[PDB]
Design a protein around this ligand. Structure first.
Ligand SMILES: [Mg+2]
Ligand SMILES: [Mg+2]
Length: 233
């Protein structure tokens, strides 16, 4: 866990800095949702923009993703690395969720363009869905293994070891610790992760509204997610 790293960002630099553009691309728009339900409609959904008001470094070694209303619209943020990694590595981020409020939908996850998703941790502000770690096999998202995870606003590390045997997850890993969830390889239909050449990219985001965020009006904004580092080894 001390490296050397295949990929890392320590998010160091002065307050108000952009994240390192050699490691991240900042989202400029929320993913459009076909046949939107109420909180997914264009007029209700939270947006993403590359604006230092929403995605910036705090000068204390953290990425800040900040959700806030600006002229009738909630804006927040997402960063995704162009860097992709294959099977057989460990992926970890140190995160503080100061955004566990109605409407928010933060996540730390590993993505793929075509099939498969590893949601290392995610919280739902909609008032209905439980915070959880989830592995998805199908693009529809509709085949998954999930485990609910109790979340607070403290600092924690969130680790996924993704190797040929599957995925193992830890919160606040320390020597000898037991994963809180394990997903066996080949345990979902058309499991994609063991395919030769399959890769994932790291993503950090704080969304507002949409399906998972729901109504932000009961929430308290601005709200933030802090990330001290992402490390892959
Ligand atoms: Mg690789
Ligand atoms: Mg840091």
């Amino acid at each position: 866990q001390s490296g050397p790293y295949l990929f890392h960002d320590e998010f160091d630099g002065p307050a108000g800095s952009a994240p390192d553009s050699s490691k991240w691309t900042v989202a400029r728009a929320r993913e459009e949702m076909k046949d939107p339900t109420y909180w997914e409609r264009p007029e209700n959904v939270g947006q993403y923009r590359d604006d230092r008001q929403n995605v910036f470094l705090d000068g204390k070694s953290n990425l800040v993703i900040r959700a806030a209303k600006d002229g009738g619209t909630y804006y927040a943020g997402k960063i995704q690395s162009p860097w992709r990694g294959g099977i057989g590595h460990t992926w970890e981020a140190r995160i503080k969720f100061d955004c566990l409020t109605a409407g928010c939908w933060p996540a730390w996850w590993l993505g793929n363009q075509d099939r498969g998703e590893i949601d290392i941790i995610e919280w739902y502000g909609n008032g209905s869905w439980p915070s959880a770690t989830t592995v998805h096999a199908k693009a529809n998202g509709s085949e998954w293994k999930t485990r609910n995870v109790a979340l607070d606003s403290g600092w924690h590390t969130w680790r996924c070891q993704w190797d040929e045997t599957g995925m193992r997850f830890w919160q606040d890993y320390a020597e000898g610790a037991q994963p809180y969830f394990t997903v066996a390889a080949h345990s979902l239909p058309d499991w994609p992760f063991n395919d030769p050449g399959y890769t994932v990219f790291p993503v950090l985001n704080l969304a507002v509204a949409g399906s998972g965020g729901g109504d932000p009006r009961p929430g308290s904004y601005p709200a933030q997610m802090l990330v001290d580092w992402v490390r892959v080894w």
